[PDB]
């Protein structure tokens, strides 16, 4: 509204929150980065769980990140 220039100089791309299934795929893609950083192992069901829990319990933080918070935090819990 305040601009009216940049507004016209780029393509608006809406970025939707990924589905829970996509989120799990993300979590799986990142699984080794968590395991390597933390020096821990995780379950595949853990990845599934984080995506689902985030969908259910963190409605102010979108999935990818919310689920990853659960993963990272969980891994940190274990690392400690």
């Amino acid at each position: 509204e305040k601009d009216g220039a940049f507004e016209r100089r780029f393509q608006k791309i809406e970025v939707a929150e990924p589905s829970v299934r996509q989120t799990v795929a993300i979590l799986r893609g990142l699984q080794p980065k968590y395991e390597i950083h933390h020096g821990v192992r995780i379950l595949d069901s853990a990845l599934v769980t984080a995506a689902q829990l985030a969908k259910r319990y963190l409605p102010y933080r979108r999935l990818p990140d919310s689920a990853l918070d659960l993963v990272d935090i969980s891994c940190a819990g274990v690392a400690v």
Binding site: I42, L43, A46
Partner: protein, 80 residues
Amino acid sequence: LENKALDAERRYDTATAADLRYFAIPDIKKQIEKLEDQVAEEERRAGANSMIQNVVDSDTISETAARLTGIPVKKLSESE
């Protein structure tokens, strides 16, 4: 190794990518598998390696989500 192989592919040095895509990368994969077998349960204990908590979907993550949001449902406690 995958990053190196991938770099070789983007460098158009595919032959050196092959040096890793074949043999080395799957060897490390197999080393990982062998290590998991070493970690795996023994007749004397539920997992050879006790410290690995294997970030458990419930015991670690549904628990973590509860540590962050309370959401007592995900405690899944025997106290029911």
